[PDB]
Design a protein around this nucleic acid. Structure first.
Lengths: 72, 55, 144, 127, 189, 125, 61, 32
RNA sequence: UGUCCUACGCCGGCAGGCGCGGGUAACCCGUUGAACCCCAUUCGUGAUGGGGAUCGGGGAUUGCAAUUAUUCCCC
């Protein structure tokens, strides 16, 4: 039915993303949005937030599609 | 003038030019004006003997 | 041997030139810099609240590339597509007041001067300032 | 970031419910009488970041936004920016938002009816 | 070496179907930097078989009105889809696309015939060129119908469709369409 | 010694002037890593990536481009560059080198030395 | 079983609207069998086809 | 090529040759 | 295509006003700086920042005359 994706991070969601996101073998705002129930802006902002800590590797960036991967 | 086809004939605009494209055209070649043209490129019954019929 | 503006990425040039003009602080920002749409075919105000600096940087770059341009040329350049309701879209020019104000502010910087044949053009101060900031951008990008 | 402890999911502004899980420049637009452009200028006149979400504003910023909303002219909002510029009964530059718009439309249609002009008679023959 | 997109090697690409070898053109003569060539590939019959197959996919992404002619958009989509495919499976996306086309082509189809009121289906075989054509068309249709109203980008759905069609899994739209077409053609011998 | 050739697409026309140099390659005063669409960037560098930078190491080319659209301008640029190189190695360098260059340019992309004869059709009454 | 077979010569366009092609088809594993098949799509000599059930011959007037 | 395209190409080549060849008050008083 | 096309300067935020020039024309608009497109930002599946109809107020322009909204601009 109607999606109810969250607009700001809850505690449990923030913890599970900070311990689960840097190993997906696919990091993209859409996929983390659909598996974490997060609206796309918050998922995006979390993704450059995780890139700022060096835990996330960028491989290409575009105005329509920015794509990441794990470090090792 | 004295060409056969002109004599045997049934008898803005001047600034139009045609290039030709062979080797690539060299504008700095002294013989390039040969590849730049100034104009556009491009009833009787026979008898049994074969002589024509004129009337 | 000196790197030219034409040898530099233009969007990073505009960004660094806008940063330089904001750092100098000698631009005459109008009072209505907040409450205006940049053309009649726009719908919202620009989100970047320092839009005057970016527009002035873009205007300086354009007058470097092709001088002799007036207000009407600037309105043609930043013109765009107006979506006319349920009617076919058309081309509409930019607002004349914003072009006039960015031209007069760049002129008050001594960056831009009038000419006899028409509208505005660059000063030698403008040319060497753009060359210097272009050298900075080329050093920050090509040497990295 | 994460949720603050004071996030308000639904705001009550001018007897209007405001969904806090929205951008502020469009949560203000959700109020009747305020569009996108007017919400953007009233939030920029209040010196409030437009990247910041609506639902976790403090009360001070909400009250300052409201005081700019019912008082535009006192905060350099231009005269040509308003809904009702020259009101026919008492000419003053105004901005009616929640119930004033519905009311002032109602007596506009009532004035059109009472003089028996073509527009009022036509619109009240339309229903 | 000629590599697609400055990265992508064509020497290790092999075709496992002998029917489609002459109609899937990814080899050293057909290896190109970009899927944009603007060649006169439809002025004569069977000419489009010599097209690089990435260019055929790019030309078949320009569908449904609004996207007509937007080829730079589709080469952007193809580039991002190839990156997503590589970063997902760890293997070259050219082989993934070749396997997806091979597993996506209908090998046996049906033809509507009739004389007067009696309309029936006759099973016929599918030529390799039409196999390639329906494979490309069904892959593009699968990606397009897959996303269309969700957070998933066209590149991610396209990458997922080529990945699942190369695997032959039933989750792909193209595989399901091929299965139902072959089931109808088998029931109309 | 110097040469001057032209290349074209539908209405986009480019003129390339080729002179001795050190390997500075320019269109409209800009480098080829600066011409507006990066998506077709490899279409610009195709003679560079096939023929190698060593064969471009002793030449300066300047191209003036006008007409058409972005894609047609790129195609005119690459056609003019390839024709300029062919003309230089025909006029002032040996014939055989021009032979392998013109060859490999043909079996990669046949349009690199001949214009595409496709243009918009007219409408009649 | 899945079979593979080369087109030898095309007999011509068949079907009510000319939507099919009747064609001469021979196997590669045993280059003695020779069959008539009808196909959908453009075909030429030298094409090789994947035949699902290789017993019956196509038949259309 | 045809008339219009060749005319544009000739003008481009002429302007390019001129700007490669390229790289005060008028004499009001006639005497030196 | 143009003696109504318009360059340029000033005022207004925009429709628009004032002045001063060019063009009876490959000479001036006009190196016709067009839109899709490309790059970057925000938006996140929600009849929603998609979609714009119908309405309320105000300003301007063409005309003897705009009411049954001539047309344009803003909210």
């Amino acid at each position: 039915d109607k999606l109810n994706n969250l607009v700001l991070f809850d505690k449990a969601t923030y913890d599970k993303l900070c311990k689960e996101v840097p190993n997906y073998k696919l990091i993209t705002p859409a996929v983390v949005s659909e598996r974490l129930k997060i609206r796309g802006s918050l998922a995006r902002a979390a993704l450059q937030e995780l890139l700022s800590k060096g835990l996330i590797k960028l491989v290409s960036k575009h105005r329509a599609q920015v794509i990441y991967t794990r470090n090792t | 003038g004295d060409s056969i086809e002109e004599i045997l004939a049934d008898s803005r605009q001047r600034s139009r030019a045609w290039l030709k494209e062979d080797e690539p055209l060299n504008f700095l070649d002294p013989k390039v004006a040969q590849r730049v043209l100034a104009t556009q490129p491009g009833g009787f019954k026979v008898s049994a003997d074969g002589r024509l019929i004129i009337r | 041997p000196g790197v030219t503006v034409k040898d530099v990425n233009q969007q990073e040039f505009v960004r660094a030139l806008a940063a330089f003009l904001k750092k100098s602080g000698k631009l005459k920002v109008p009072e209505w810099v907040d409450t205006v749409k940049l053309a009649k075919h726009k719908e919202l105000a620009p989100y970047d609240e320092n839009w005057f600096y970016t527009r002035a940087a873009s205007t300086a770059r354009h007058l470097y590339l092709r001088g002799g341009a007036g207000v009407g040329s600037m309105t043609k350049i930043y013109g765009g597509r107006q979506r006319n309701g349920v009617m076919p879209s058309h081309f509409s020019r930019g607002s004349k007041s914003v072009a006039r104000r960015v031209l007069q502010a760049l002129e008050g910087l001594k960056m831009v001067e009038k000419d006899q044949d028409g509208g505005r053009k660059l000063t030698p101060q403008g040319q060497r300032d753009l060359d210097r900031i272009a050298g900075q951008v080329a050093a920050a990008n090509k040497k990295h | 970031l994460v949720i603050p402890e004071k996030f308000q999911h639904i705001l009550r502004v001018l007897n209007t419910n405001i969904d806090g899980r929205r951008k502020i420049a469009f949560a203000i637009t959700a109020i009747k009488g305020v569009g996108r452009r007017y919400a953007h200028v009233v939030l920029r006149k209040a010196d409030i970041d437009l990247t910041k979400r609506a639902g976790e504003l403090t009360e001070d910023e909400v009250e300052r936004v409201i005081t700019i909303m019912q008082n535009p002219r006192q905060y350099k909002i231009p005269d040509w920016f308003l809904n009702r510029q020259k009101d026919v009964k008492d000419g003053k530059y105004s901005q009616v938002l929640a119930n004033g718009l519905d009311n002032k439309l109602r007596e506009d249609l009532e004035r059109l009816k009472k003089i028996r002009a073509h527009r009022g008679l036509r619109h009240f023959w339309g229903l | 070496d000629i590599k697609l997109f400055g990265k992508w090697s064509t020497d290790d690409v092999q075709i496992n179907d002998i029917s489609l070898q002459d109609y899937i053109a990814v080899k050293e003569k057909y290896a190109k930097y970009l899927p944009h060539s603007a060649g006169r590939y439809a002025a004569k019959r069977f000419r489009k078989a010599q097209c690089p197959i990435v260019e055929r996919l790019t030309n078949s992404m320009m569908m449904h009105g609004r996207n007509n002619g937007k080829k730079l958009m589709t080469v952007r989509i193809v580039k991002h889809a190839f990156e997503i495919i590589h970063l997902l499976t760890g293997e070259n996306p050219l082989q993934v696309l070749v396997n997806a086309i091979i597993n996506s082509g209908p090998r046996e189809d049906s033809t509507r015939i009739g004389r007067a009121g009696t309309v029936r289906r006759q099973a016929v075989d599918v030529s390799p060129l039409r196999r390639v054509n329906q494979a490309i068309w069904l892959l593009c249709t699968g990606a397009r119908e897959a996303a269309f109203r969700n957070i998933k980008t066209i590149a991610e759905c396209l990458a997922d469709e080529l990945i699942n069609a190369a695997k032959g899994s039933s989750n792909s739209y193209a595989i399901k369409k091929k299965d139902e077409l072959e089931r109808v053609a088998k029931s109309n011998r | 010694q110097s040469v001057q050739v032209f290349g074209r697409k539908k209405t986009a026309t480019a003129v390339a002037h080729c002179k001795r140099g050190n390997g500075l390659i320019k269109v409209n005063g800009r480098p080829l890593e600066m011409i507006e669409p990066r998506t077709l960037q490899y279409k610009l560098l195709e003679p560079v990536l096939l023929l190698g930078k060593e064969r471009f190491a002793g030449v300066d080319i300047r191209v003036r481009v006008k007409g058409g659209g972005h894609v047609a301008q790129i195609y005119a640029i690459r056609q003019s560059i390839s024709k300029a190189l062919v003309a230089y190695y025909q006029k002032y360098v040996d014939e055989a080198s021009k032979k392998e260059i013109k060859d490999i340019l043909i079996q990669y992309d046949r349009t690199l030395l001949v214009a595409d004869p496709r243009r918009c059709e007219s409408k009649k009454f | 079983p899945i079979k593979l077979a080369r087109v030898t010569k095309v007999l011509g366009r068949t079907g009510s609207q000319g939507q099919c092609t009747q064609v001469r088809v021979e196997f590669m594993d045993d280059t003695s069998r020779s069959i008539i098949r009808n196909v959908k799509g453009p075909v030429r000599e030298g094409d090789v086809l994947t035949l699902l059930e290789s017993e019956r011959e196509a038949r259309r007037l | 090529v045809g008339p219009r395209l060749s005319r544009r190409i000739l003008q481009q080549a002429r302007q390019q040759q001129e700007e490669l060849e390229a790289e005060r008050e008028r004499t009001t008083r006639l005497g030196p």
